[PDB]
Amino acid sequence: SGFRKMAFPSGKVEGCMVQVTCGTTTLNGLWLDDVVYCPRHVICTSEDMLNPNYEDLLIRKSNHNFLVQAGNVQLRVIGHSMQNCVLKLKVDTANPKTPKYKFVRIQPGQTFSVLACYNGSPSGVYQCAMRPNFTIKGSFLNGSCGSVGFNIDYDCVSFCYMHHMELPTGVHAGTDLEGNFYGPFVDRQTAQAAGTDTTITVNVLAWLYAAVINGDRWFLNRFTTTLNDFNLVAMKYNYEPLTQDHVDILGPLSAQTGIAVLDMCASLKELLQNGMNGRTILGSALLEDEFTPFDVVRQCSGVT
Amino acid sequence: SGFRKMAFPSGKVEGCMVQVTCGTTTLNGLWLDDVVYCPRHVICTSEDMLNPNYEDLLIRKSNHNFLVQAGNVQLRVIGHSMQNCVLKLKVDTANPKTPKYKFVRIQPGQTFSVLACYNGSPSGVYQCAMRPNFTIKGSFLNGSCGSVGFNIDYDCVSFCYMHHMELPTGVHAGTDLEGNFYGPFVDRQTAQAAGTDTTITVNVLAWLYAAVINGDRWFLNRFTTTLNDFNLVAMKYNYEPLTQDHVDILGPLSAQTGIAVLDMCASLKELLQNGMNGRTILGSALLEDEFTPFDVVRQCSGVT
Ligand SMILES: Cc1ccncc1NC(=O)Cc1cc(Cl)cc(-c2ccc(C)c(F)c2F)c1
Ligand SMILES: Cc1ccncc1NC(=O)Cc1cc(Cl)cc(-c2ccc(C)c(F)c2F)c1
């Protein structure tokens, strides 16, 4: 028992981290097979960042200008190309530590682990969710660009995020491994609005099921609700509308605990309307939304 | 910016995890050099657990009864011995993935990462603190015994915890890598009181400094306090008494922010006496105590 914000073991990803330097800029790269992936803003100087013409900036660069180092050894760059907001540096050596991997575009509300890196060296690992507004609330400092987000299913690492920037609001923005930003963001130092965010209702309900499994049950009540009534409350409290698809995803947890999804919705409705009254749930004094139903089942079942 | 409950990258430790089976019981072992370390309760049957005579139970076992498997390959056991509550199984092969390591006994209030494992396979990693009462609030299921806690300084892994049991209260107990329990616990299925726990004051203050560094400053006030006055409030709210040693450990964070430690104590005093009034600090609605001053400096400086 016990419930923690658990990240995937980072070993398979640590073996892929490299340092990429172009001119004066050093950031992280991800070495899979004979390709190193990194944010294209590595080719920018501070002056270029206000409105960079990435095509023109990349034309001034040659393979020998991209310094790629895997720990202590230098990699030889034999090709370079830009795909959306990422640079792909072809190297003459396949990474011997390349795990089985896939590139995936995660959906908002889904979670993943981040291996925060500086100078190609891993510093720490943490779990987070892709917010409904396509930002992440991470922990990144200058030099962390190119750090990646991922999930692991058995021996396969599905890479879903590469870190590009921190907006003035302190939130983080990045791309999939094909260089497409999540959300409306651009890799340019210009004002950028992140959309209105919402709380991930299905994840809060999953976390309430995790609380029941782990013995925190004080919030269970004698009430029930309907999807329509619950959604009126979700609207008022800026929660994502619950759909039948969400109810079905919560099916396994409902079966495990014997608590109907709509009965758990009535508990969540009362918590939204009354607050916690100074009490806690799984060590938290707020409603947690960065655990998916799959995360709860995985952590509560011991999937390796 | 941003502040997360960050764990160390687990790769160096993943390379040390093995499965240990004795009779009917399977748990995790830690393979360093030519020794595999694991909880001695692996030699128990369910009936033995009420009052096991570990010396007598171990006498009925031979080297060939300890089945040690590192992933897919079987290890050959050439010696066995019990040291306190751990078994040390000498194997004929040194682990080629043995990182630079040390065995350390951590102090209460200190933090470490846990690589939760099942059947010798890593499942996830999370950060936690050794509570003042020598328990940990982890996330462990049956089969997680032998999972380890650790810290990493550069290329050296300091192992500090090995998981042994979950008490009826849902808290976790374990040993250092010499098999000595943290706290008053015994590896026996018998009633065991964990002492009165307290909140780790120096860690809460460190986390308030982390909040200021990351822009959450609403709790800063026009007040100051003394160590004596603060400690009267700490007593009332079951917080550890703050000492001059704690003030000195907070020195680097005080210098970085320009906020005197006793001024931060007055902010903490007001938060203890008034609560948060429905507000949050670094995404939390409660006062967080599982970040040490060193953790805050490390995360805020990007140490790899
Ligand atoms: C410092 C740091 C901390 C954590 N994570 C990453 C970083 N580095 C960056 O954000 C670098 C970067 C790159 C790009 Cl392409 C755009 C911007 C940027 C975007 C919008 C605004 C308005 C602005 F001021 C900006 F500087 C900034
Ligand atoms: C199931 C689980 C979940 C998370 N982590 C670990 C485990 N496994 C265990 O705790 C196994 C174990 C071993 C030892 Cl030596 C003593 C006890 C034990 C101690 C005290 C009591 C009263 C009691 F009921 C007990 F079973 C229990």
Curated annotation (Swiss-Prot), chains A, B:
Changing P132H: In strain: Omicron/BA.1, Omicron/BA.2, Omicron/BA.2.12.1, Omicron/BA.2.75, Omicron/BA.4, Omicron/BA.5, Omicron/BQ.1.1, Omicron/XBB.1.5, Omicron/EG.5.1. There is a cross-link at K5, K90 (Glycyl lysine isopeptide (Lys-Gly) (interchain with G-Cter in ubiquitin)). Inhibited by pyridone-containing alpha-ketoamides compounds 13a and 13b. In turn, alpha-ketoamide 13b (tert-butyl (1-((S)-1-(((S)-4-(benzylamino)-3,4-dioxo-1-((S)-2-oxopyrrolidin-3-yl)butan-2-yl)amino)-3-cyclopropyl-1-oxopropan-2-yl)-2-oxo-1,2-dihydropyridin-3-yl)carbamate) inhibits SARS-CoV-2 replication in human lung cells. Inhibited ex vivo by michael acceptor inhibitor N3. Inhibited ex vivo by compound 11a and 11b. Changing C145A: Complete loss of 3C-like proteinase nsp5 cleavage. It comes from the Viruses. Residues 1-304 are cytoplasmic. Changing N142A: Does not affect ability to cleave and inactivate human TRMT1. Residues 1-304 form the Peptidase C30 domain. The active site is at H41 (for 3cl-pro activity), C145 (nucleophile). It catalyses: TSAVLQ-|-SGFRK-NH2 and SGVTFQ-|-GKFKK the two peptides corresponding to the two self-cleavage sites of the SARS 3C-like proteinase are the two most reactive peptide substrates. The enzyme exhibits a strong preference for substrates containing Gln at P1 position and Leu at P2 position. It is found in: Host cytoplasm; Host Golgi apparatus; Host nucleus. Cleaves the C-terminus of replicase polyprotein at 11 sites. Recognizes substrates containing the core sequence [ILMVF]-Q-|-[SGACN]. Cleaves and inactivates human TRMT1, preventing tRNA guanine(26)-dimethylation of tRNAs. May cleave human NLRP1 in lung epithelial cells, thereby activating the NLRP1 inflammasome pathway. May cleave human GSDMD, triggering alternative GSDME-mediated epithelial cell death upon activation of the NLRP1 inflammasome, which may enhance the release interleukins 1B, 6, 16 and 18. Also able to bind an ADP-ribose-1''-phosphate (ADRP). 3CL-PRO exists as monomer and homodimer. Only the homodimer shows catalytic activity. Interacts with host FBXO22; this interaction promotes the proteasomal degradation of nsp5. This is 3C-like proteinase nsp5. It comes from Severe acute respiratory syndrome coronavirus 2.
